[PDB]
Amino acid sequence: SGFRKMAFPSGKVEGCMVQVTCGTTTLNGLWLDDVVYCPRHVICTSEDMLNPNYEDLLIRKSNHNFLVQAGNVQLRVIGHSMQNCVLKLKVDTANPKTPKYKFVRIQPGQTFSVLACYNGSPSGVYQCAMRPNFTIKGSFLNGSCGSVGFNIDYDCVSFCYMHHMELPTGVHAGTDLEGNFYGPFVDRQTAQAAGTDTTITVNVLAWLYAAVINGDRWFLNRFTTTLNDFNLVAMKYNYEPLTQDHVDILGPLSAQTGIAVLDMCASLKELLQNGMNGRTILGSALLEDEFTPFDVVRQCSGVTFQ
Amino acid sequence: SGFRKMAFPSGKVEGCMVQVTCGTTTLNGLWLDDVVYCPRHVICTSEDMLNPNYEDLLIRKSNHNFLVQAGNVQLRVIGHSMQNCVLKLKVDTANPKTPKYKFVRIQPGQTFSVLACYNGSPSGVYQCAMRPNFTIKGSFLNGSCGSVGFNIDYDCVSFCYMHHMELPTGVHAGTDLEGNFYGPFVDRQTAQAAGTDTTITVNVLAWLYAAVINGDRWFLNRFTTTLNDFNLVAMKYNYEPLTQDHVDILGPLSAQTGIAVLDMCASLKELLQNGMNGRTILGSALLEDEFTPFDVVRQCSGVTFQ
Numbered sequence A, B: 001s002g003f004r005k006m007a008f009p010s011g012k013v014e015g016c017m018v019q020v021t022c023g024t025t026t027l028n029g030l031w032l033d034d035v036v037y038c039p040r041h042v043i044c045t046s047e048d049m050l051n052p053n054y055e056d057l058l059i060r061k062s063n064h065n066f067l068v069q070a071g072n073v074q075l076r077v078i079g080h081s082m083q084n085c086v087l088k089l090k091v092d093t094a095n096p097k098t099p100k101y102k103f104v105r106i107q108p109g110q111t112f113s114v115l116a117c118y119n120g121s122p123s124g125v126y127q128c129a130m131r132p133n134f135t136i137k138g139s140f141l142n143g144s145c146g147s148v149g150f151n152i153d154y155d156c157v158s159f160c161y162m163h164h165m166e167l168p169t170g171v172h173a174g175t176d177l178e179g180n181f182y183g184p185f186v187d188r189q190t191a192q193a194a195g196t197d198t199t200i201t202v203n204v205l206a207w208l209y210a211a212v213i214n215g216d217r218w219f220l221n222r223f224t225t226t227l228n229d230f231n232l233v234a235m236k237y238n239y240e241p242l243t244q245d246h247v248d249i250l251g252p253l254s255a256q257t258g259i260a261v262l263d264m265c266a267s268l269k270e271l272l273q274n275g276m277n278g279r280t281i282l283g284s285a286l287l288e289d290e291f292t293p294f295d296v297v298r299q300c301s302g303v304t305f306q
């Protein structure tokens, strides 16, 4: 049936994207009900970004200083406040296209769809994981800030990411929708790098199950292993420890394919120690770690409106 | 800045998806203005699909036999006709969410976004290429039929694919929106396989340019080559011939990076002959051929509403 990096359909979020301009600085914002959420550094010029005092820049602004555009309709701002690294702009019109929604803070290892936007207008959608080092491997240019990441579950959009910045090796950092950074990063143009990343073990195992489901089974061996013994090995290759919680979350896939989790662990142990020997799994030459157990079930069970 | 398999934002097409039921068979349809387009085999039961006579099945149907649902609103059908492998259902309500749109027949090598749908409801979006053998490497389950592929250009959705069937090695076949199959495939459950596939040379070159743009340049050599000499080599590794038209289409990327097309050809020739030596290009261990020159520019230049 096939297996692809699938993004959540983006319509629900496209209806919420707007452009926010303060002075000559413009970026994206998220219009939910009568509030627009955008990165606080919309209030910054070039100069300001080496070392901004945001409380200071902001006190010098007033409501009318923020130009909010939904398409070519302007929205009138009637209040503003800063929450962490995010600015909230109260507008006098509720977004009629607001979907049912929640703000969530995802954990390292969870995947989400990014709607990359420029000028309040949607460029594309793609799927990402929050890496263990709290970066995302994105695709973002100048003007993408305020682009958002999200999950859908039936009718409900859980927004979990807002884009702020690009770190030295071409990866990305940002906040939840309460303006709290993932990872130890700050919103200033100063030198910062991600710590060392690690592979999301549980996701690799999920992807292996997806391969069994798709009939790609060559890598299955005859062995089992213990959780402890598996994890000593994983450690060497810079894989996350697999926890009981991760084992439990793989339970659906385990039960569908009839392969015990620790049996799949034994197969992965071998792949880490022997390599793939120029073979692919699901068309791919490396082990993939940006599919969660839920992503595999969704794609393999056909879960819709999400 | 990063480089991902980016899909077109799907909102414009999500607003057009509906469920079509005839008897006990249900699949997806596309509601544009006052017409619903769906695969003609909505008129088939299990039995019928070994060897269907579609003109015969259809003459026995009337308008009221087709249950069209947009969400939980039913649409009243007032006419029907078959065009090739597609059924057109005239309904008495125009879809107010119809975007500006065109039907196009893409060429082998062009990419598009698939909105995978079940029960007239959107499951996910992903990017695909029309392979030289006229299949797509999709991700599709039972009930996905009538899912559509499309490009966006500013406000305009060009629909180029409608999903019909899955071929032996887990790849996919379907029609344009006039119901004409890509490739020599037919809509019956009979034995059919894709011919041998080939790599889309021009797309590989475009992706290499994307890598140079992203600062991944290790694979650039000091050489040039002729088009003829390049193509003799490509042939051995089962790459499409590169034409002057393909050279011309790579002109923007060539000019932006300052690397002549035939110089990039020389670098690819080496990669085909030497392999990648356990190195990656843009995180990937294999050469990727499902990005067009336009896809690279769009993603690298930040082109929106598309």
Ligand SMILES: *[C@@](O)(c1nc2cc(I)ccc2s1)[C@@H](C[C@H]1CCNC1=O)NC(=O)[C@@H]1[C@@H]2[C@H](CN1C(=O)[C@@H](NC(=O)C(F)(F)F)C(C)(C)C)C2(C)C
Binding pocket: A025, A027, A039, A041, A042, A044, A045, A046, A049, A140, A141, A142, A143, A144, A145, A146, A164, A165, A166, A167, A168, A172, A186, A187, A188, A189, A190, A191, A192, A193, B001
């Ligand atoms: C973004 O879109 C924003 N652009 C601007 C421009 C102005 I004038 C004011 C505020 C903002 S937010 C986004 C840009 C793109 C840039 C390339 N890839 C992205 O993801 N954000 C930034 O430019 C942020 C912003 C400044 C500096 N910055 C960075 O991403 C920079 N990174 C860093 O300095 C480091 F910490 F290493 F990550 C840089 C531009 C990539 C060098 C803020 C406030 C951090």
Ligand SMILES: *[C@@](O)(c1nc2cc(I)ccc2s1)[C@@H](C[C@H]1CCNC1=O)NC(=O)[C@@H]1[C@@H]2[C@H](CN1C(=O)[C@@H](NC(=O)C(F)(F)F)C(C)(C)C)C2(C)C
Binding pocket: A001, B025, B027, B039, B041, B042, B044, B045, B046, B049, B140, B141, B142, B143, B144, B145, B146, B164, B165, B166, B167, B168, B172, B186, B187, B188, B189, B190, B191, B192, B193
């Ligand atoms: C699709 O969603 C449809 N399902 C039905 C069910 C009925 I009853 C009537 C009409 C349709 S269209 C889609 C299904 C999924 C199936 C798994 N992956 C897909 O892409 N289409 C089909 O089931 C089509 C349909 C029958 C047989 N068929 C196939 O895809 C089959 N392939 C072939 O026989 C072969 F030619 F090799 F490709 C099969 C189900 C994968 C074995 C039509 C009319 C071709």
